[PDB]
Amino acid sequence: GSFVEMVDNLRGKSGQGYYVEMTVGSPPQTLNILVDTGSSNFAVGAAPHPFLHRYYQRQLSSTYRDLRKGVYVPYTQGKWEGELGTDLVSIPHGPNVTVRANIAAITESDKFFINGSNWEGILGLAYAEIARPDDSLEPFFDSLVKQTHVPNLFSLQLCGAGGSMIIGGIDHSLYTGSLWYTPIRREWYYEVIIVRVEINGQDLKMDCKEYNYDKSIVDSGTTNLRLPKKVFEAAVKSIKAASSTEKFPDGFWLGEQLVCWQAGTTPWNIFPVISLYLMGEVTNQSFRITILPQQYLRPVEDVATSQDDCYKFAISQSSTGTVMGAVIMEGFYVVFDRARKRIGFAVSACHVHDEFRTAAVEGPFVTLDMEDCGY
Ligand SMILES: CC#Cc1cncc(-c2cccc([C@@]3(c4cc(C)c(=O)n(CC)c4)N=C(N)c4c(F)cccc43)c2)c1
Numbered sequence: 001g002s003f004v005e006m007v008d009n010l011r012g013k014s015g016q017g018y019y020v021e022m023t024v025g026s027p028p029q030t031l032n033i034l035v036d037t038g039s040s041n042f043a044v045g046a047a048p049h050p051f052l053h054r055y056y057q058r059q060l061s062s063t064y065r066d067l068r069k070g071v072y073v074p075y076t077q078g079k080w081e082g083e084l085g086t087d088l089v090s091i092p093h094g095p096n097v098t099v100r101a102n103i104a105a106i107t108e109s110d111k112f113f114i115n116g117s118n119w120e121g122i123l124g125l126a127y128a129e130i131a132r133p134d135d136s137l138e139p140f141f142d143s144l145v146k147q148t149h150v151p152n153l154f155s156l157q158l159c160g161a162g163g164s165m166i167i168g169g170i171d172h173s174l175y176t177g178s179l180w181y182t183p184i185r186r187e188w189y190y191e192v193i194i195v196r197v198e199i200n201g202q203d204l205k206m207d208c209k210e211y212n213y214d215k216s217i218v219d220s221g222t223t224n225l226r227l228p229k230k231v232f233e234a235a236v237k238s239i240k241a242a243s244s245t246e247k248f249p250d251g252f253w254l255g256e257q258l259v260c261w262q263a264g265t266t267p268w269n270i271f272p273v274i275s276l277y278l279m280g281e282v283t284n285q286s287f288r289i290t291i292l293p294q295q296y297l298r299p300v301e302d303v304a305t306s307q308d309d310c311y312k313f314a315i316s317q318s319s320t321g322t323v324m325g326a327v328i329m330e331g332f333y334v335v336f337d338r339a340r341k342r343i344g345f346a347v348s349a350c351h352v353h354d355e356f357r358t359a360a361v362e363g364p365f366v367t368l369d370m371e372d373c374g375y
Contacts, residue, residue: 001096287363
């Protein structure tokens, strides 16, 4: 179960999710599971559904234990409902271990499962504070650390059109340059602090608390870079100005319409780079991660539109704070250092670049005239 054996253990894409193979029950039942740093339940399809190729069959598992407790989870975009239980879980291309973990067996759901996503469940990697029905339900990663010798750290190398999830350590072959750390503000979501935002080197000039209204998180279970209204509007106005040689419909900027160019002609150069400055481990020091248009213009693979390269604008408005989703994580090696309450970023081996620009992790930056950016 070495790190080299864990490399390339993920499949999928930013739009439908990145997933890892796992087994549940005895004899083991293989399932594809979405790697989700934005939730804390290990929730798996346990009943037939039109979008599921397979599902967890508890009756076939001699090791299943029923907790006699239901779980009901409505959220803005949909819902899932299920039964809580425990069973044996393993990650075949992960650590060489088997643990007993809580499993929420999904019996009913609405707009939860995605057609052609190729996953049957979700591995919620965030903390117990946000687990459903409450924080008494121990998340999977917590059970793994308690029951094995596994160091309290995992890292994600998401690669654009799979990637790697290394549990227990840092795989140096997955990144170049320096690894810059941002503190985990609170252990609920992987909450962080953005101190500055620039669009093509031009500062958005907002009070830094605006960037974190009401929180900022690192979420591998969200596709887009999601920004609070005020920040979102300034970003769009700034991107529109930088790209003014071409005019796109309002629907493109709203993320409801594709923009298409003849195959291979995408004018990358007309789109600016976005720099997100994250709080450093030292007072008023920060580092920046730079996002190229290859990251924020998400390609939409469709045989029917294939004479063209078509894209969705992968930056959208949020009313629940900033979400640094998969389009942000792609091309970075992201270390979820739970042991040291910090998140590391470095340029990935699968990073984005063209012949003019490259995604980067750079620092340090100093800001003497700073307030706390935390909301
Ligand atoms: C990259 C990527 C991705 C991706 C693409 N399509 C669907 C999903 C998805 C499907 C179902 C549920 C969730 C989702 C999620 C997962 C679980 C287990 C859960 O209990 N909830 C509700 C609290 C939400 N995980 C999130 N991080 C998230 C989010 F920020 C906003 C809405 C929904 C979610 C996410 C993820």
